[PDB]
Write an enzyme that holds these catalytic residues in place. Structure first.
Site, PDB file in Angstrom:
ATOM      1  CG  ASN A 176      -1.777   1.246   1.332  1.00 44.78           C
ATOM      2  OD1 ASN A 176      -1.819   2.091   0.434  1.00 44.78           O
ATOM      3  ND2 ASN A 176      -2.473   1.364   2.451  1.00 44.78           N
ATOM      4  CE1 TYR A 191      -3.165  12.307   2.105  1.00 47.21           C
ATOM      5  CE2 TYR A 191      -5.530  11.954   2.125  1.00 47.21           C
ATOM      6  CZ  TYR A 191      -4.309  11.857   2.747  1.00 47.21           C
ATOM      7  OH  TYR A 191      -4.211  11.278   3.997  1.00 47.21           O
ATOM      8  CD  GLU A 212      -7.552  11.227   5.189  1.00 46.51           C
ATOM      9  OE1 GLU A 212      -8.531  10.697   5.759  1.00 46.51           O
ATOM     10  OE2 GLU A 212      -6.578  10.559   4.772  1.00 46.51           O
TER      11      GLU A 212
END
Length: 189
Positions: free
Chosen positions: A44, A76, A85
């Site tokens: 990941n 992001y 977030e």
């Protein structure tokens, strides 16, 4: 085995994280350019270039995005006070990363409708430690791999749904992969 790399390169903030360094290669290149290759359907990772702090800015990006499986391409970032977030998802592979979030409307900007979602992460890792924070998502319907993103239009749309954004922390054009394979070269400006 984990690896986290941040700093300033070519005049841009960069961030790279993975829990499998052997199957992902992140390369910083000149200006806001970076490349990432991942293989073996193992690991990941999230990496990219941008700014720290972020802001309500127009983010221009271009390049090549060639995922093979679970992966997304997104603006992001984080804010503080409140802790938030956020994801502006421009493209994704075989999984919608918005999955599980609560639908919260639509916004039309930059040549496409974006579906908005909100979600709460409870006692989850954050830039401030383990916290309970809010998440905002805008997922582009018309997938693309180059263009301009009016972040302020998303920030305004999100503020009509829940808590408004706080003080900006980092803000990057991120490539992500979850046990998949692919390659990507992107340039932010």
């Amino acid at each position: 085995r984990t690896q986290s790399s941040t700093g300033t390169h070519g005049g841009y903030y960069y961030s790279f994280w993975t829990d499998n360094p052997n199957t992902v290669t992140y390369t910083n290149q000149n200006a806001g350019q970076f490349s990432v290759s991942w293989s073996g359907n193992q690991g990941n990772f999230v990496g990219g270039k941008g700014w720290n702090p972020g802001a309500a800015r127009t983010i221009k990006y271009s390049g090549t995005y060639n995922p093979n499986g679970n992966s997304y391409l997104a603006v992001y970032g984080w804010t503080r006070n409140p802790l938030i977030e956020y994801y502006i998802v421009e493209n994704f592979g075989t999984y919608n990363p918005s999955s599980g979030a609560t639908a919260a409307g639509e916004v039309t900007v930059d040549g496409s409708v974006y579906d908005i979602y909100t979600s709460t992460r409870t006692n989850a890792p954050s830039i401030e430690g383990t916290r309970t924070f809010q998440q905002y998502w805008s997922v582009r319907r018309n997938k693309r791999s180059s263009g301009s993103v009016n972040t302020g239009a998303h920030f305004n749309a999100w503020s009509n749904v829940g808590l408004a954004l706080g003080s900006h922390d980092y803000q990057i054009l991120a490539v992500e992969g979850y046990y998949s394979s692919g390659s990507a070269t992107m340039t932010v400006s």
